[PDB]
Amino acid sequence: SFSGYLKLTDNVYIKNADIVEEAKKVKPTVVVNAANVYLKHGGGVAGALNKATNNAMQVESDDYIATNGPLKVGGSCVLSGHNLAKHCLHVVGPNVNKGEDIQLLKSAYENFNQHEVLLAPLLSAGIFGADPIHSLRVCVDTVRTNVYLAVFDKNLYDKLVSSFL
């Protein structure tokens, strides 16, 4: 199972790790994708997870969108985890670079509560434009299930741990 994590709270754990490499190693029941409403996995975590599936995630996602239409900002859907996990929970955090309401970040993290344990990135961080320190705070104050956070950047990981209240 999960190794080398720092325990932040009763249920939140954090590690400086590449979430693709972490998913390939652990093969968790659920890996969270930092999705957009269209499930267009172009960059950031989504681009990396999709590339690790050899584009199978994007093909499955395009069929999901063709059937169901776009997700809501703050929403999610469960799709296959392909070669990375049993399932992928595609969660849409607000993209500050698109002018989306940061208050939807709590709604986005509430999707994690439907799964007992997840491997996840910080929602709305990175190319989504939000402050990762704030994202971690909302995560610990919203998620009650066991969440193993993978933070790609070592420098950001150190800043998140050193500033954690």
Ligand X SMILES: COc1cccc([C@H]2CCOC[C@H]2C(=O)O)c1
- Integer Rg of the chain from CA: 14
List of residues 6+ apart from 42 with CB closer than 8 A:
none
- Residue 68: exposed, middle, or buried by beta-carbon count in 10 A (0-12, 13-18, 19+)? exposed
Minimum separation from the CB atom of position 132 to ligand X (A): 5
Minimum separation from the CB atom of position 83 to ligand X (A): 16
**CA-to-CA separations, 80 to 56, 152, 155, 163, in angstroms, rounded:** 9, 23, 32, 35
- 96 scored as a contact of ligand X (CB under 6 A): no
87-91 and 30-34 strand pairing: parallel
CA distance 76 to 37: 9
Which of 36, 126, 138, 142 is close enough to bind ligand X by CB under 6 A?
126
**Chain residues 9-28 in contact with ligand X, contact rule CB under 6 A:** 18-19
Which of 121, 138, 142, 148 is close enough to bind ligand X by CB under 6 A?
121
| HSE (side-chain half, CA atoms, 13 Å) at 5 | 23
Minimum separation from the CB atom of position 99 to ligand X (A): 19
Instruction: With CB under 6 A as the rule, give the number of residues binding ligand X.
Output: 14
Minimum separation from the CB atom of position 151 to ligand X (A): 4
**Chain residues 28-87 in contact with ligand X, contact rule CB under 6 A:** 44-45, 48
In the block, tokens 């199978």 appear at 56
- 122 scored as a contact of ligand X (CB under 6 A): yes
- 119 scored as a contact of ligand X (CB under 6 A): no
- 151 scored as a contact of ligand X (CB under 6 A): yes
Interface residues with ligand X (CB under 6 A)?
18-19, 44-45, 48, 121-122, 125-126, 132, 151-153, 156
